[PDB]
Scaffold this active site. Structure first.
Site, PDB file in Angstrom:
ATOM      1  N   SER A   1      18.708  37.603  52.068  1.00 47.05           N
ATOM      2  CA  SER A   1      19.555  36.830  51.416  1.00 47.05           C
ATOM      3  C   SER A   1      19.732  35.481  51.750  1.00 47.05           C
ATOM      4  O   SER A   1      19.091  35.000  52.625  1.00 47.05           O
ATOM      5  CB  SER A   1      20.949  37.361  52.092  1.00 47.05           C
ATOM      6  OG  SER A   1      21.921  36.591  51.798  1.00 47.05           O
TER       7      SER A   1
ATOM      8  N   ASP B   1      20.939  57.972  51.456  1.00 44.25           N
ATOM      9  CA  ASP B   1      20.371  57.070  52.233  1.00 44.25           C
ATOM     10  C   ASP B   1      19.542  56.286  52.147  1.00 44.25           C
ATOM     11  O   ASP B   1      18.369  56.695  52.443  1.00 44.25           O
ATOM     12  CB  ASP B   1      20.482  57.810  53.537  1.00 44.25           C
ATOM     13  CG  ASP B   1      19.972  57.101  54.881  1.00 44.25           C
ATOM     14  OD1 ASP B   1      20.495  55.612  54.810  1.00 44.25           O
ATOM     15  OD2 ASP B   1      19.926  57.584  55.844  1.00 44.25           O
TER      16      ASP B   1
END
Length: 330
Positions: A199, A35
């Site tokens: 992004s 994770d």
């Protein structure tokens, strides 16, 4: 040193991925959920409340000659999906894919929430976010990666998750045969303890690319792709009959649909998520309403590039003095 381990979807939907991890002496192999959005290595154990164990493999520290109780240490964690666990702490030897750390904090669960109990395939979590998020008190502990870093050939690990197929976590090297083209690297903020990046935009299907900054985290422990409501609405608008359902808890779509791809930007590069990756199947057995793999982050407080996004790429988690993230197509 290096390590390399195969990671395997837990079910036919890729709801999560498990990777075998050797703990203790002699080795006890548990299948952990790696994770990159948390920083605790915790396991089902001989200390876990018996009624909260249902099929998981447990770590038994009393059977490990290298286990040592970390005196006075406790831990307690709550995840974004509302699940939680807590307990005490041992140090022990932990190996992943041939890479060994001695003195790793292994957090032994005394209590786990129902979602953990109900998932027989996940024996615990191995956190790979920054150690500043580790919950051990009163002395915070380091992640497996943080402990291994100095010994690694290069201070990196990579995630290569499969779509409906196994994939690989590598530590200490970049497998140049595992991706196509070049890796595009992008800046990371560690301010919130995550692999947080920005992004450069998105496209839906064959549509034009929208240049827009989307801050979010690269999180292997989250199944879906969670993005701003504007972006998510633009995606589902291209699927006839798709709608957001408050009763179901997100966007659903007719199972008869063919889903468009979704592209996200990494600098000037582009990662394409095929439409099929966005299908999470019937909302309930036999239903013709299917759950979407792109969902709104509104009310999470953060955008999450979870498995839906990451499995479309070869992803480098570069833990150099100034961390960065790399993405390549594959």
């Amino acid at each position: 040193s290096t390590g390399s381990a195969t990671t395997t979807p837990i079910d036919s939907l890729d709801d999560a991925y498990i990777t075998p991890v050797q703990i203790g002496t002699p080795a006890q192999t548990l299948n952990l959920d790696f994770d990159t959005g948390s920083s605790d290595l915790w396991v089902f154990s001989s200390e876990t409340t018996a009624s909260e164990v249902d099929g998981q493999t447990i770590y038994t520290p009393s059977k490990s000659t290298t286990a040592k109780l970390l005196s006075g240490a406790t831990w307690s964690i709550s995840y974004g999906d509302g699940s939680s666990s807590s307990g005490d702490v041992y140090t022990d030897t932990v190996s992943v894919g041939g890479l060994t750390v001695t003195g790793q904090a292994v957090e032994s669960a005394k209590k786990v929430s129902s979602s953990f109990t109900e998932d027989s395939t996940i024996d615990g979590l191995l956190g790979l976010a920054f150690s500043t998020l580790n919950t051990v008190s009163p002395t915070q502990q380091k992640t497996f990666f943080d402990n291994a870093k100095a010994s690694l050939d290069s201070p990196v690990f990579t995630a290569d998750l499969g779509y409906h197929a196994p994939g690989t976590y590598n530590f200490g090297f970049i497998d140049t045969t595992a991706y196509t083209g070049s890796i595009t690297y992008t800046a990371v903020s560690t301010k919130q303890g995550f692999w947080e990046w920005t992004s450069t935009g998105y496209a839906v299907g064959s549509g034009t690319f929208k240049s827009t900054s989307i801050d979010g985290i690269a999180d292997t422990g989250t199944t879906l792709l969670y993005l701003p409501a504007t972006v998510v609405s633009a995606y589902w608008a291209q699927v006839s009959g798709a709608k957001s359902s408050s009763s179901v808890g997100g966007y659903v779509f007719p199972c008869s649909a063919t889903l468009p791809s979704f592209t996200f930007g990494v600098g000037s590069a582009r990662i394409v998520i095929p439409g099929d990756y966005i299908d999470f199947g019937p909302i309930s057995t036999g239903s013709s309403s299917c759950f979407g793999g792109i969902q709104s982050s509104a009310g999470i407080g953060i955008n999450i590039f979870g498995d839906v996004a990451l499995k479309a790429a070869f992803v480098v988690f570069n833990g150099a003095t100034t961390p960065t993230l790399g993405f390549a197509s594959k």
